[PDB]
Symmetry: C3
Subunit: 72 residues, 3 copies
């Protein structure tokens, strides 16, 4: 799963920015790229679920119609 | 799709913060608002899919029950 | 809903970073942790919907097969 890789990568960069808080600006900027990539990967997965739900809707509808048509 | 607009808007702001790294703090702060907006828009879409899945669950359940009831 | 709590928490931290823009670096770093947590919580919910969709797929498939088998 890429998203968990981008999340682990962001968790590392977070610890480094916090430790460095205790190089920083560049690390904050990189971390913003990590988060943006995660959001983008999540958006891709979300789009897939939306299409999957539409597919299931069509399949259920076909079954409901079949059962209506069998009653005649 | 708003989310792809907020993602494009974040991708631009990322390039600018990276180029400016090579105005910065304000750009990092704005980029944080872009990412927050994207997460919020994704949350809205995610909530819709959760409700869509519940609707499909109810529709399948009604069909399963109909088929059980037809067996009598 | 945790995600709306993490989103409210991020919205507060955003206003503070913007007001402070008008303490900042630490607030930007903390806000990055807020956003990362939101993305992670969203990922958890997204994974649940993926599994829910698979469950519905199996349920619809069982009904489609039952109806095929009844035709004999």
């Amino acid at each position: 799963p890429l998203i968990e890789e981008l999340i682990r990568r962001s968790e590392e960069q977070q610890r480094r920015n916090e430790e460095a808080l205790r190089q920083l600006l560049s690390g904050i900027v990189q971390q913003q790229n990590n988060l943006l990539r995660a959001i983008e990967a999540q958006q891709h997965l979300l789009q897939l679920t939306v299409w999957g739900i539409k597919q299931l809707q069509a399949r259920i509808l076909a079954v409901e119609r079949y059962l209506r048509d069998q009653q005649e």
